[PDB]
C-alpha cells in the first residue's frame, strides 16, 4: 500500500532514497536500478509527512522532515539504526517545506509553516538548536528555497500570492526582507532558485492559478524580469518546480499527470524539451 507519497529526496550520492507519505511514515530505501530495497520506516509524526530532505553528507546522515503536525523532526542514522535526534516546531500550524542550506553556511535549515513564518534553525556545538525566525507571509507560506552564493538569500512562496527574497544582515541578526514580487492570482504553490552560477539568476515560481513566472535578474542590480513561461494556463493547477544542476533546465510537476520540461533558448524565452 501506498496510495500517496507527498515528497521524496535523493542523497548527495543518490544511493539512499527517502519517501514520505500521508500515513505519517518516512520510508528509507537502498536504491539500485530497478531494485530499491526497503531498509527503514520511521514513525513519529502526528500528521501526513509533507516533505523529507537530507543534509550535506558533511554532517553525517541527517534528514530534516516537515509534517502536518506543525512539527519539524530532524532524524539521523546511527550505526545502522535511525533515531529522532532533535525537533523544532515553534510554528502554530502545518509545516510545509524544509530545505537545508549550502554547506558553506554550516548546517542551517529552512522551514516554512502556515503561520506565515519561516525559520533558520542552526545547530550549535552541543548539537542543540538556536532558532532565528521571521514572519514571511500573512495568510500562510507554501514554500521557501535557498540560494547558492559566493550576502545569503532564499525565496519564499506564499498564500497572498507573493514571492519574497530575504537577505541575511549582521545589523539585524535576522534575515532582512529586501525584495518581493507579485504576479500570481492564487497561493504561490512552489518557488525555486537555480544552481546556475552563470551570467544571471533564475527563479521559476509555480502556482495554483496554473501559471509559471520566471524571475530572471540581470545581476545584483536590475530588478527581476517577469516572464510567464507560456501564456496559457496548464490544464490543472501546478505543484512543484525544480531546477536541474548541470543544464539550468526546469521541470514542472503540474497537477495533470506528467512533468513538463522547459529550457531557455537564445530568445531568452523558454521552450519544451523531453
Amino acid at each position: 500500500h501506498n496510495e500517496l507519497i507527498h515528497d521524496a529526496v535523493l542523497d548527495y550520492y543518490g544511493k539512499r532514497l527517502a519517501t514520505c507519505s500521508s500515513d505519517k511514515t518516512i520510508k528509507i530505501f537502498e536504491v539500485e536500478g530497478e531494485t530499491h530495497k526497503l531498509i527503514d520506516t520511521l514513525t513519529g509524526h502526528e500528521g501526513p509527512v509533507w516533505r523529507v530532505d537530507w543534509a550535506h553528507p558533511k554532517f553525517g546522515t541527517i534528514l530534516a522532515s516537515c509534517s502536518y503536525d506543525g512539527k519539524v523532526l530532524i532524524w539521523k542514522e546511527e550505526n545502522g539504526r535511525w533515531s529522532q535526534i532533535a525537533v523544532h516546531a515553534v510554528h502554530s500550524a502545518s509545516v510545509n517545506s524544509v530545505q537545508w542550506a549550502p554547506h558553506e553556511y554550516g548546517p542551517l535549515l529552512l522551514v516554512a509553516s502556515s503561520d506565515g513564518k519561516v525559520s533558520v534553525v542552526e545547530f550549535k556545538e552541543n548539537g542543540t538548536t538556536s532558532p532565528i525566525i521571521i514572519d514571511a507571509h500573512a495568510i500562510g507560506v507554501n514554500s521557501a528555497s535557498w540560494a547558492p552564493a559566493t550576502s545569503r538569500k532564499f525565496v519564499t512562496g506564499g498564500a497572498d500570492n507573493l514571492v519574497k527574497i530575504w537577505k541575511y544582515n549582521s545589523d539585524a541578526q535576522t534575515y532582512v526582507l529586501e525584495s518581493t514580487l507579485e504576479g500570481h492570482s492564487d497561493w504561490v504553490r512552489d518557488v525555486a532558485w537555480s544552481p546556475t552560477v552563470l551570467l544571471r539568476s533564475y527563479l521559476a515560481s509555480v502556482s495554483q492559478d496554473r501559471t509559471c513566472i520566471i524571475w530572471t535578474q540581470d545581476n545584483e542590480q536590475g530588478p527581476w524580469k517577469k516572464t510567464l513561461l507560456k501564456e496559457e494556463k496548464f490544464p490543472d493547477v501546478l505543484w512543484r518546480a525544480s531546477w536541474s544542476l548541470s543544464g539550468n533546465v526546469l521541470a514542472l510537476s503540474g497537477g495533470d499527470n506528467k512533468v513538463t520540461l522547459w529550457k531557455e533558448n537564445l530568445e531568452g524565452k523558454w521552450e519544451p524539451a523531453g
Partner: protein, 434 residues
C-alpha cells in the same frame, strides 16, 4: 430519527482527511518532482515499490561513439592541459582536434559523415609536403589543393542527381552541358567531338583554365548574340555562359536553373569556372551565396556560409543559431574548438564557453561524467571552470575511479586536493574514515 453509532471510526478519518486536503488546497491531482543531484528526475509513481520513479532524463545528445570510452581516451591524447593562471584547475592549452578525426567513428554513408567530412575539407589545415621556393607560393598551392578537394567532393554528392538527368536527356548538347555539371571537361569534350559539335569541343577544353581572354571573349559572343542573334541553341549558350566565368552573375544567366538543380549543383559551377584565380575560396563561395538563398534548415549549407563568412564567422554563427538546429550541440562545440585552437577563426571567450557549457551538460545528463569533465576544461572562465569541475568531481568521485581510462581522467589535471577532498566526504557519508 438520527441515530448514534460507536464504530464511527472509519468515518472519522474519512472526514478528518477531506478536512486536511481542502485546508491545504491539496487537490487529488497531486504530482511532485525535483531534479536529482545526479541530474535526473523522480516523480510520484504509484506502480513501483517506493512511489517514485528513477527517471533517466532523456538525452538530447544523440551520437553513438560518445558512449564509448575508447573515443574519449584517444581524444585526450590530442589535448595539452595546463593549470590555470588564477587557480590550480586544468584548462586546455593545446588541441589538435580536427573534424577529420571523428570520421573513423561514423558511417561513410551517414549524412553526418558528410557534415564532418566537408567541414574537414574546408577547415582542417591542409598540408603540403613538397617544399616551395617561396612561401607565398606555398599559400597558392594550398589553395589549389583545398579547392581541388572541395570541388571533387561536391561532385560526389551531385553525382547521382546529374547522372539521372543525363539518363533522360534526349538532346546531345544538353548532355555535354550535364557532364560539365559533374566537372568532367574531357567527357564533355569527347561527346562534343562525337556529336559533330567540333568547334564547341575545343572551347570546352578551356573550362578550368581561368584564362581572362577567353572569359571576355565568351561574354562578348554572348552579348553580340542577345542583341539580335535570331537564334542560338539553348545549351550552347549555357556552355558559353560557363566560359564567361560568371554564370549567374550576368546577362544570359543560369540563375533560372535554380529550379532544376541542387543548390549544391549550381554552387559547383561557380566554384569550378567562376574565376578561381582572382578570388579566395571564401569570397568566391560568398560570391555564389550572395546570388541564391539556401534552405534555412540545411546543414551542409550552414557550413558553406560559416566558411564563406570568414570575416564575421561568429556574427553568422550566432545568427545561424537563432534560426535552425541543423548544427547540434556537440558539433557547434567541436567546431568552435577546432577553429579556436587552429587560428582558423575567432570566437568570443563567451561564445566559446556558452558552447562548452551546453555540451558539458548534455554529457552530464547522459551519465558520461568523465567525458563531460574533459569538455569542461575548454572553459575560458577560470571561476566557472573551477566550480563546474569541483562540484562534479565530488558529487561523483566514485565512478570516476575504476578504469585507467578513468585514471588518465583524474590524471587530466584534477587538483590533488579536490580528488581526496571529495574522497573524504565519500567516507563520512559511508562511515569508514581514514
Amino acid at each position: 430519527h438520527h441515530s448514534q453509532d460507536p464504530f464511527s471510526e472509519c468515518n472519522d478519518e474519512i472526514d478528518n482527511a477531506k478536512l486536511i486536503m481542502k485546508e491545504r488546497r491539496f487537490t487529488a491531482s497531486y504530482t511532485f518532482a525535483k531534479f536529482s543531484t545526479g541530474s535526473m528526475l523522480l516523480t510520484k509513481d504509484i506502480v513501483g515499490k517506493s512511489g517514485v520513479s528513477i527517471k533517466r532524463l532523456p538525452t538530447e545528445l544523440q551520437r553513438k561513439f560518445l558512449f564509448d570510452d575508447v573515443y574519449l581516451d584517444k581524444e585526450i591524447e590530442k589535448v595539452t592541459i595546463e593549470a590555470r593562471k588564477s587557480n590550480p584547475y586544468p584548462q586546455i592549452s593545446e588541441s589538435s582536434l580536427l573534424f577529420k578525426d571523428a570520421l573513423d567513428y561514423m558511417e561513410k554513408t551517414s549524412s553526418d559523415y558528410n557534415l564532418w567530412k566537408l567541414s574537414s575539407i574546408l577547415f582542417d589545415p591542409v598540408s603540403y609536403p613538397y617544399k616551395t621556393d617561396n612561401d607565398q607560393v606555398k599559400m597558392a598551392l594550398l589553395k589549389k589543393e583545398r579547392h581541388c578537394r572541395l570541388t571533387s567532393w561536391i561532385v560526389s554528392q551531385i553525382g547521382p542527381e546529374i547522372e539521372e538527368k543525363i539518363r533522360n536527356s534526349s538532346n546531345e548538347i544538353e548532355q555535354i552541358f550535364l557532364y560539365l555539371l559533374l566537372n568532367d571537361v574531357v567527357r564533355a569534350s569527347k561527346l562534343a567531338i562525337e556529336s559533330k559539335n567540333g568547334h564547341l569541343s575545343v572551347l570546352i577544353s578551356y573550362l578550368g583554365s581561368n584564362d581572362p581572354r577567353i572569359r571576355d571573349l565568351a561574354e562578348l559572343q554572348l552579348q553580340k548574340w542577345s542583341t539580335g542573334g535570331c537564334s542560338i541553341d539553348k545549351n550552347i549558350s549555357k556552355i558559353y555562359k560557363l566560359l564567361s566565368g560568371s554564370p549567374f552573375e550576368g546577362l544570359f544567366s543560369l540563375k533560372e536553373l535554380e529550379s532544376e538543380f541542387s543548390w549544391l549543383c549550381l554552387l559547383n559551377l561557380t566554384l569550378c569556372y567562376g574565376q578561381i584565380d582572382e578570388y579566395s575560396l571564401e569570397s568566391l563561395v560568398q560570391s555564389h551565396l550572395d546570388k541564391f538563398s539556401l534552405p534555412y534548415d540545411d546543414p551542409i549549407g550552414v557550413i558553406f556560409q560559416l566558411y564563406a563568412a570568414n570575416e564575421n564567422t561568429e556574427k553568422l554563427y550566432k545568427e545561424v543559431r537563432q534560426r535552425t538546429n541543423a548544427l547540434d550541440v556537440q558539433f557547434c562545440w567541436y567546431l568552435i574548438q577546432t577553429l579556436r585552437f587552429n587560428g582558423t577563426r575567432v570566437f568570443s571567450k563567451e561564445t566559446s564557453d556558452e558552447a562548452t557549457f551546453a555540451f558539458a551538460a548534455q554529457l552530464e545528463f547522459a551519465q558520461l561524467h568523465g567525458h563531460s569533465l574533459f569538455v569542461s576544461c575548454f572553459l575560458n572562465d577560470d571561476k566557472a571552470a573551477e566550480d563546474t569541475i569541483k562540484r562534479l568531481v565530488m558529487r561523483e568521485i566514485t565512478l570516476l575511479r575504476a578504469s585507467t581510462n578513468d585514471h588518465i581522467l583524474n590524471r587530466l589535471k584534477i587538483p590533488s586536493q579536490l580528488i581526496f577532498n571529495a574522497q573524504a566526504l565519500k567516507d563520512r557519508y559511508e562511515g569508514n574514515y581514514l
